[PDB]
Design a protein around this ligand. Sequence first.
Ligand code: CL
Ligand code: CL
Ligand code: CL
Ligand code: CL
Ligand code: CU1
Ligand code: CU1
Lengths: 311, 311
Amino acid sequence: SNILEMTKNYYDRSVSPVEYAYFDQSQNMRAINWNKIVDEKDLEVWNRVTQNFWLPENIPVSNDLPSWNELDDDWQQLITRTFTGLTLLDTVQSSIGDVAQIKNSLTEQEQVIYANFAFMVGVHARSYGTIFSTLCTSEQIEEAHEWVVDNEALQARPKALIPFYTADDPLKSKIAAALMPGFLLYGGFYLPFYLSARGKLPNTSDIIRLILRDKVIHNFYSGYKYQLKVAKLSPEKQAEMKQFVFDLLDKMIGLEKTYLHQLYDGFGLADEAIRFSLYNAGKFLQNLGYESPFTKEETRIAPEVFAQLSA
Amino acid sequence: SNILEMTKNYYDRSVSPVEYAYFDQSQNMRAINWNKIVDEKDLEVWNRVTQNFWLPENIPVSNDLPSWNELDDDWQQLITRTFTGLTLLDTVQSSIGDVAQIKNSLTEQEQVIYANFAFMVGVHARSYGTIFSTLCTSEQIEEAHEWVVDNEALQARPKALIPFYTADDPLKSKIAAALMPGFLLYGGFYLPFYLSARGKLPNTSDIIRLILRDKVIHNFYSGYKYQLKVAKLSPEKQAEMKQFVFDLLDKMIGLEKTYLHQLYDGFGLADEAIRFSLYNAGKFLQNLGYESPFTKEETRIAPEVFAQLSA
Ligand SMILES: [Cl-]
Ligand SMILES: [Cl-]
Ligand SMILES: [Cl-]
Ligand SMILES: [Cl-]
Ligand SMILES: [Cu+]
Ligand SMILES: [Cu+]
């Protein structure tokens, strides 16, 4: 009788609203408690992403018009197409991926952080529109949208990830959520950094660096939460989930290579864009707590391009 | 044919990713187009809510310590309880309500605006935490959480709305989404406006006004989208939906009056808070395109409270 509980704390006999909504209606709901934080990492991430709030109106893209006008119609078309492709991936992540993570949160604050991610990835998608409004003709903008809809190699990539978001396996959904910021857009981000290394569209690369300042935290955070959940599996199911991560990444690399060859082969950027992509595939695995199986040679980035990425 | 259509518009032969995820896989996905906007109201709302970005760290709540210390322990408890009750409603809306609206959007931009709403309602919930961190003891904060979990009259209100969010009727989900910012938190906001009218906690009322600057747009926007969708239904289905709105508001007013009497009867604020609540119930109906049935007498607000509201 030394250990009898006469006073049960409110937290352990209540559920967050999203748990009440989708999982269990047998207990009453608790309001989020920002005064007693379960995981200090959540407060650190919340503070950084909110402090890093930006809008594309903040960047004078109109100052890129001189260097934009130096590029021929084929280069301008490549940039508009590439960025409309990245707009599609951001639309998938903002409208499906991030908000699917909310109900699978380990902590109250994580629910609010994924709401921030959904909004800020929406700002990322909106940023390409700001660039197009300033630089592109109406014809270039409409052509790029037509090209995205009709590009099967482009479409294959989000079509591969969306099922994990809409299915009922929260760990597979979390892996998909990490793979988007961790890997899938870097093939596209190569192009603006290739150009800004040569002094072309520098203001556009400032927008890409603001996008990446968010995406690196998104990848870190989803990877961190993945590691906390996978640690709660049996060693058998742990090894099983690791194999799934490597199998899914192997598949997505296959689809990304096909798309980047189609996108870039005509411009001689395919090989370097794929190396840049695999460098980030390595970082993605590291943020899930795994070792990168990729060689120095097959992840090689030109110093002038790496300088644009890390700035 | 005098009109030659050489190609078919990409938009009419593609779906947004969230439509692809949940409703229709018959066509490929289109990237959001911020360059050709279907509804200029979406751009106006996007620009206003993003330009209105704020964090509770922006407001010096520490300057309220003198007026907070003037308030007796029972008034401090009432404020902590009331605000933890509002925190629960914001947690419901941020984690379930707003994100549930994304897949039911009429336009691409609406998907991104509801992501902004989810994030900003998260900031609203967080702002109570900031106030508590500055003003309240650990004991007051824990007591208020215990009080929220064990308050059946409080819990009844979100428990009535959450089923509309998780169900597959998008119009009933939209009405629930409008009811939260339009009606359910005004009973609670009465208290800080009452206090600031008497010169107490002025900095806290600045946070409440920043919250209300967001919530008035949330209510307007959800009501605007409700009106566009319901207008396309048969006269009989429009009549059915109008009856549902009035029936649900009638139920929620019943639950709100019970909760506000329990909250405020001891302080003699219940009748005044309920009139303030019903005034806003009238505005909620107007924002759905219906007429207010409420009398002048049952919606009467003291000028000094209305002054704090509209400042
Ligand atoms: Cl992302
Ligand atoms: Cl993300
Ligand atoms: Cl709200
Ligand atoms: Cl809302
Ligand atoms: Cu992201
Ligand atoms: Cu709201």
